[PDB]
């Protein structure tokens, strides 16, 4: 599977994947903050 | 890219992806222990 | 209440102040890009590197960005290549804000609106590595489109009506399909040939006859138009010189 | 204090009025007679605006307002306390704008370039004059001009827009909005194309006019040209301003009713007036 | 006295274009010439590039347009006459509040959602097309990001703010007069949208874009007798046209740009016009219920 | 029949076919989702 | 069916496939979240 | 080239199958959690 | 009266005549459809 | 102080100073006209 | 993992990292300020 | 202190200082005019 | 740690750091001024 | 700290300090003027 | 600038700045006599 880096440059692949992962993490975190159960800052009761 | 450096990048990229997935899996297991995110038939509680 | 952050401060205000900070940074960036030509500033009289500038000087001038050409050439911006302090003119007053009296014929001395940038002696290139500004004789494929007056053989006159010369050839840009120059043979000197920019012409297709008129310079001024070397391919400096000379007409077309 | 190429065009002449009296520079600025006059009008107008702020109750920059006289004064000059200050600031602003444009004309003559820039500024001056002079004169009172205030001239815009109950339905307003939006889109495209041609990436030698034409030939299907784009952009902006002026002359001086139900004419053309 | 406002004499040659890799699709359009376009600009028309992303975008966009038009024609019971009468007043209305972000019935906003999804997909695919076309010609992607700003405003209006409100009910309809009425009612529901400060910023940047593209157009037309229209060549090799363009604004204004940096200003004013607008749209309803009360609280209004 | 590819480039034919089929299938799924009967996620009763 | 890569280019095909798969995954996840039965973040009661 | 297409397909199919296997396992788990084909009386 | 055909070539003359006459026919038919008396489709009574 | 004319040309500084003085005088007159005690045209009573 | 700087310029990467961390920290601080529990300026009660 | 003129031209220093002082004086005068206590034109009682 | 100045012009670093620190200090001061408790100019009571 | 003038030209530092401290003095004075307590022009009561 | 005029210019500048400062100080003294601008802990009674 090492040959995929033949097709794609390590540096552009690294920066693109880094931005993608950070944006996805931010999006998931904001979704969780939007939900009542999983907002760890408001801390709504499970009940 | 050169195959010689491609092998090295693939090796340590594989190690780094293993590290990231492991840390994320630990985080997910901690969150699941705190509050599971798969509801039961009657909701959550 | 719903949107507040601390009592009086709310989310919209915070995002507004974030925008203000970003816009200050963007203005700094844009001013840095602006200061890529003609910088740093010189003294108005002596020409030493001096200007009333504060702590932003370190951030005022950017590092020279590098432009690559499709010939192996390179431009540096900013390149700190400045003009000579001593020009062919003298200060009306020695107060650093006074204008300049030309000390000769400013048409041919390149002073004021006649002044031309000190470019490089290479013609503009096309996608095929050939000159872009060429006469229509050496571009058989290019032709003047119909429904338009063909500006070949039409008398070239000034505003006073005197027939300065006769047009023989058109010079055109290959990169952008449009006429750039008219080649004009002098009625006073057959052995002399000049180039008159197409932007300086009126079509004048609606009159008793068809003629080309110029409102900038007079007929006699056609005897001192700057010349070119190759007569079939013109460098950037030569074309800039000719355009500057023609554009200098409006200011002082009747002596100085 | 001069650019690397500045101490070559700093010749005298090119001034309409003043001879050699004001033909000089102060710092980077060229002064001329009309620079002196624009200082005269700007200082006086700004001082009068600050004076009206002092007479006002706020000093809050966004709540500072200079109001025109009440419509009960008609086209008469008003007392300075109540309406007249707005009128003097209006006249000073008109004088300063005209001086600015004329100084631009002198600079254009001095540099031997076309007078396109002052001509284009003339349209902004005309829009302002139509808003504070032409339309109030046609409507018959100076109180139909807008107040000189940061947020209060927006209150004027909103009040006059809802005076015709929906000002979007003004067809000249629709056309002016279309031209303004198209000007912004065309400016984005032009700046983007020039920057992309000049900055094509790592390696990536600077591209020529043929590459710029090819980009929009491939993406859109037509390319205006590196000269024609500035033409169409200037015409777009000037036409947006012209149609805004038209839509404001049409509202009040000509049309004094609901713009939304102006369009019933369209509803009742004879080939679908089902009745 | 010539002005370079219209091209009196035109030139027509063999059509040609910059070289691209052949790819799956060739250039299409059998280029021709037009006279009025050559009077105002260039005369050649086409050819248009139609790649895989181009086909995808065109298919999605055509599906959205056909859905919208079919719904508009069906709303007037398929009457061409009455379609002509009400065309401006016709609109594909978004689904009501009760349906949330899920699929509404086709008559109750399902068609609006499907059309909006297809239009969003076609717009994003067109963005990808601009990016790929710029990259193929060995150029920069400034146009793609300038377009991305406009797409941000579009998605904020149509999708992102519905996401934040959890509701498509307050999205903008697919109609000529209906979308203006949406604009009016959106401003009224949230208190004098003039008092939105990001609306003020967006208006400032729209006015500034018009101002800038009149200033720059008039400057280039004023130095077009000096080779000033050939901007990229004056960027790589500074001619006297660029020098006089800079000195005019330096003498009349105190400062000046470069032939290269003026287009950076042009890019950023246009981009910010829609960036601030998208931010202001995302802020209303979610954070600020009433922009007039926000302005009163923050000193924009005299506090009635 | 066998010469249908002598008039159409197989790459262009495949790309156009895939694009059209994908968009059509997406549209059909969206339409069924917009129904009281075929929305398999809302799961409304037949009766 | 190994000749599918003799028509198109591996690198562009791979980036297109990854982008399409990610966008489809996002769309399906968002649709599931918009439904009451399958929203795993909100409290979802079957009855 | 077309010679490299053989190895590219050899690894591409393995990636297809592993991705599909993970997706199918996910679908099976979700179906256990909540099946998505309702019955005649809707969901219950 | 035949002298028309050396100023107006029959190609453009006849295509213009066709477009004009077709547009006029559409106009008259639509205008009739807008009137109650002559709308042959709705068929409102004469009285 | 007689040396100030070495720093500023009289022929133009004089005219600029005249313009500034006129602006200041006209501004002060406008301010007085804006008042209630010093408006000599309204002539409002001090008592 | 020291070869990452053979791909990324240490100056550019360090500047970008510093700016990204500053914006992330600023956003997290403002998010905590927005919440009732973790706003340390008003200091609302836990109960 | 006199070395300050080896940093700054005297002519431009004089013109800039005059402009700044005049603008400041205008500002302070206007601020006092807007003040109830210090408006010498409106002249309200300080008691 | 003394090597960072080989990456950055000390003038650039110093001026940028002074700018960032002053802007941050202004930001914090204004945020405190917005609070009821830490506003030292109106000085609302702790109680 | 006598060495900082090797980095900062005295003209630049002096002009920057003049402008920055003038702006800061204006800002602080205007903040004081907008306060109920330290506005020395209306002189509102302390108690 | 030529240092041969800095001696004269600084002395003129110092004389004029002291004159301006003294005139301003006398004006401020007169205004304070008419109406002081520093309230006591009751206001402007
Ligand atoms: C808000 C919502 C969004 C809206 C969008 C728009 C927002 C507004 C911002 C964007 C639009 C404006 C953008 C321009 C901002 C920057 C302008 C600028 O840098 O101009 C510098 C320009 C001088 O250019 P420079 O090259 O920086 O010269 C400084 C030299 O070091 C030394 O120069 P010198 O020694 O030659 O100067 C001598 C000069 C004194 O010069 C000055 O007064 C300017 C001092 C600052 C420079 O002499 C006198 O005038 C007396 O001077 C001005 O600012 C003119 C005024 C323009 C603003 C009014
Ligand atoms: C100080 C405190 C305040 C900060 C003020 C910063 C002022 C902005 C500086 C600036 O405008 O630089 C323009 C500068 C112009 O580049 P250039 O000299 O035309 O490129 C020449 C290359 O040969 C050719 O370059 P290329 O065309 O290959 O470069 C493409 C490049 C971007 O290059 C461009 O196409 C032109 C610039 C697009 C906007 C980039 C600036 C975004 C705002 C500043 C960050 O693509 C990107 O990196 C993505 C940028 C846009 C992402 C927007 C996503 C949403 C972000 C906001 C939510 O572009 C960038 O600096 C890119 C920044 C990438 C990181 C963005 C992080 C977000
Ligand atoms: C009673 C109404 C009320 C009133 C008070 C008032 C007045 C004024 N306003 Mg405003 N406005 C109000 C409401 C309001 N206002 C705006 C917006 C603005 C911005 C738009 C910038 C732009 O380019 O948009 C336009 C750009 C867009 C929408 C984004 C890009 C669009 C794209 C890529 C579409 C691609 C399309 C296709 C491929 C074609 C096929 C599709 C189909 C057939 C369906 C601009 C600055 C602007 C100007 C002024 C002025 C000058 C005035 C004056 C003189 O009074 N207004 C938007 C916005 O950004 O708000 C923050 C917005 O959403 C919104 C609202 C609700
Ligand atoms: C800075 C902010 C600025 C603001 C002020 C601003 C506003 C508005 N910008 C607006 C519209 C568009 N903007 C664009 C494009 C996208 C095309 C698209 O999505 O096609 C994708 C859609 C579709 C495919 C759907 C339909 C299709 C039709 C009608 C054809 C159907 C028939 C077919 C296919 C069959 C026949 C034909 C065959 C060949 C078989 C359109 C024309 C683009 C850009 N804006 C930028 C910026 C700005 N846009 C930049 C930088 C751009 C680009 O790069 C890009 C472009 O191509 O520009 C040339 C509107 C309506 C605006 C308003 C005022 O509301
Ligand atoms: C010019 C065109 C401007 C268009 C957008 C104007 C937006 C201003 C709306 C607004 O008013 O935003 C407010 C001020 O922002 C501010 O000044 C921030 C500072 C404003 C700087 C303006 C720079 C222009 C260049 C929010 O801040 P506050 O803490 O409440 O301030 C309160 C006091 O200022 C007034 O009591
Ligand atoms: C592409 C096609 C899919 C687009 C949608 C993607 C998912 C959006 C969130 C779904 C959701 O769960 O959003 C639902 C909630 C509202 O839920 P509610 O409380 O109204 O619930 C009522 C019952 N459902 O949004 C939020 O509050 C959070 C908003 C987070 C930010 C929204 C903007 C995201 C823009 C897209 C970014 C994509 C980046 C991807 C990484 C590169
Ligand atoms: C070719 O056409 C022929 C037949 C001649 C005629 C056909 C059609 C005609 C005449 C069409 C006319 C159309 C008109 C008049 C259109 C007017 C359009 C206007 C002015 C639109 C303006 C604004 C609308 C906007 C900005 C809408 C944006 C909506 C968005 C971005 C919505 C996105 C929604 C999504 C992604 C939904 C997600 C939810 C679900 C779960 C359903 O997604 C799968
Ligand atoms: C590698 C990092 C990322 C990891 C991402 C993978 C996360 C996977 C999460 C889901 C895995 C399955 O998790 C399993 O789901 C089933 C439903 O089918 C849950 O179901 C069980 O617990 C719930 C709790 O209320 C009961 O109501 C239910 O009756 C019972 O069947 C299990 O508690 C859980 O163990
Ligand atoms: C799923 C919900 C609806 C959203 C639509 C999702 C599918 C459509 C977007 C998929 C992503 C497209 O992403 C893009 O795909 C196309 C192939 O299709 C590829 O691009 C391809 O076509 C271009 C067209 O110019 C050609 O140069 C060449 O044939 C190839 O590069 C790009 O390398 C990839 O960046
Ligand atoms: C790559 C991923 C591929 C995914 C492929 C998915 C295939 C779907 C398989 C469907 C199997 C059908 O399985 C059968 O369906 C019927 C409806 O017809 C459902 O019927 C059952 O459930 C419904 C709803 O929960 C209730 O009314 C009741 O419990 C019962 O009728 C059940 O789910 C099952 O008895
Ligand atoms: C260019 C010239 C600039 C000149 C600037 C001058 C700055 C200093 C001026 C004010 C100096 C302080 O002036 C002093 O203030 C105190 C307040 O503490 C006041 O104190 C006096 O009046 C107050 C009431 O008004 C009484 O409560 C107090 O008992 C009494 O002593 C007086 O007003 C004055 O004695
Ligand atoms: Fe341009």
PDB file of C-alpha atoms in Angstrom, chain I:
ATOM      1  CA  UNK I   1     -44.563  45.457 -57.411  1.00  0.00           C
ATOM      2  CA  UNK I   2     -42.122  42.607 -57.954  1.00  0.00           C
ATOM      3  CA  UNK I   3     -39.190  44.994 -57.520  1.00  0.00           C
ATOM      4  CA  UNK I   4     -39.135  44.127 -53.805  1.00  0.00           C
ATOM      5  CA  UNK I   5     -36.950  41.081 -54.423  1.00  0.00           C
ATOM      6  CA  UNK I   6     -33.741  42.865 -55.444  1.00  0.00           C
ATOM      7  CA  UNK I   7     -33.572  44.705 -52.098  1.00  0.00           C
ATOM      8  CA  UNK I   8     -34.961  41.957 -49.834  1.00  0.00           C
ATOM      9  CA  UNK I   9     -33.564  38.502 -50.483  1.00  0.00           C
ATOM     10  CA  UNK I  10     -36.374  35.922 -50.152  1.00  0.00           C
ATOM     11  CA  UNK I  11     -34.488  33.986 -47.457  1.00  0.00           C
ATOM     12  CA  UNK I  12     -34.493  36.777 -44.863  1.00  0.00           C
ATOM     13  CA  UNK I  13     -37.760  38.271 -46.144  1.00  0.00           C
ATOM     14  CA  UNK I  14     -39.652  34.984 -45.808  1.00  0.00           C
ATOM     15  CA  UNK I  15     -38.117  34.017 -42.464  1.00  0.00           C
ATOM     16  CA  UNK I  16     -39.041  37.455 -41.106  1.00  0.00           C
ATOM     17  CA  UNK I  17     -42.540  37.205 -42.552  1.00  0.00           C
ATOM     18  CA  UNK I  18     -42.954  33.755 -40.985  1.00  0.00           C
ATOM     19  CA  UNK I  19     -41.795  34.908 -37.553  1.00  0.00           C
ATOM     20  CA  UNK I  20     -43.952  38.046 -37.698  1.00  0.00           C
ATOM     21  CA  UNK I  21     -47.084  36.204 -38.821  1.00  0.00           C
ATOM     22  CA  UNK I  22     -46.631  33.405 -36.282  1.00  0.00           C
ATOM     23  CA  UNK I  23     -46.123  35.900 -33.450  1.00  0.00           C
ATOM     24  CA  UNK I  24     -49.186  37.864 -34.577  1.00  0.00           C
ATOM     25  CA  UNK I  25     -51.284  34.691 -34.720  1.00  0.00           C
ATOM     26  CA  UNK I  26     -50.176  33.737 -31.212  1.00  0.00           C
ATOM     27  CA  UNK I  27     -51.003  37.274 -30.065  1.00  0.00           C
ATOM     28  CA  UNK I  28     -54.498  37.295 -31.538  1.00  0.00           C
ATOM     29  CA  UNK I  29     -55.308  33.806 -30.260  1.00  0.00           C
ATOM     30  CA  UNK I  30     -54.124  34.680 -26.742  1.00  0.00           C
ATOM     31  CA  UNK I  31     -56.065  37.956 -26.741  1.00  0.00           C
ATOM     32  CA  UNK I  32     -59.178  36.013 -27.731  1.00  0.00           C
ATOM     33  CA  UNK I  33     -58.492  33.469 -24.982  1.00  0.00           C
ATOM     34  CA  UNK I  34     -58.375  36.321 -22.462  1.00  0.00           C
ATOM     35  CA  UNK I  35     -61.879  37.471 -23.468  1.00  0.00           C
ATOM     36  CA  UNK I  36     -64.875  35.543 -22.166  1.00  0.00           C
ATOM     37  CA  UNK I  37     -66.910  35.865 -25.364  1.00  0.00           C
ATOM     38  CA  UNK I  38     -64.319  34.316 -27.683  1.00  0.00           C
ATOM     39  CA  UNK I  39     -62.568  31.837 -25.378  1.00  0.00           C
ATOM     40  CA  UNK I  40     -63.543  28.718 -27.319  1.00  0.00           C
ATOM     41  CA  UNK I  41     -62.049  26.454 -24.638  1.00  0.00           C
ATOM     42  CA  UNK I  42     -63.734  27.761 -21.489  1.00  0.00           C
ATOM     43  CA  UNK I  43     -66.853  28.332 -23.578  1.00  0.00           C
ATOM     44  CA  UNK I  44     -68.718  30.858 -21.469  1.00  0.00           C
ATOM     45  CA  UNK I  45     -72.268  31.435 -22.663  1.00  0.00           C
ATOM     46  CA  UNK I  46     -73.124  34.315 -24.985  1.00  0.00           C
ATOM     47  CA  UNK I  47     -75.670  35.663 -22.487  1.00  0.00           C
TER      48      UNK I  47
END
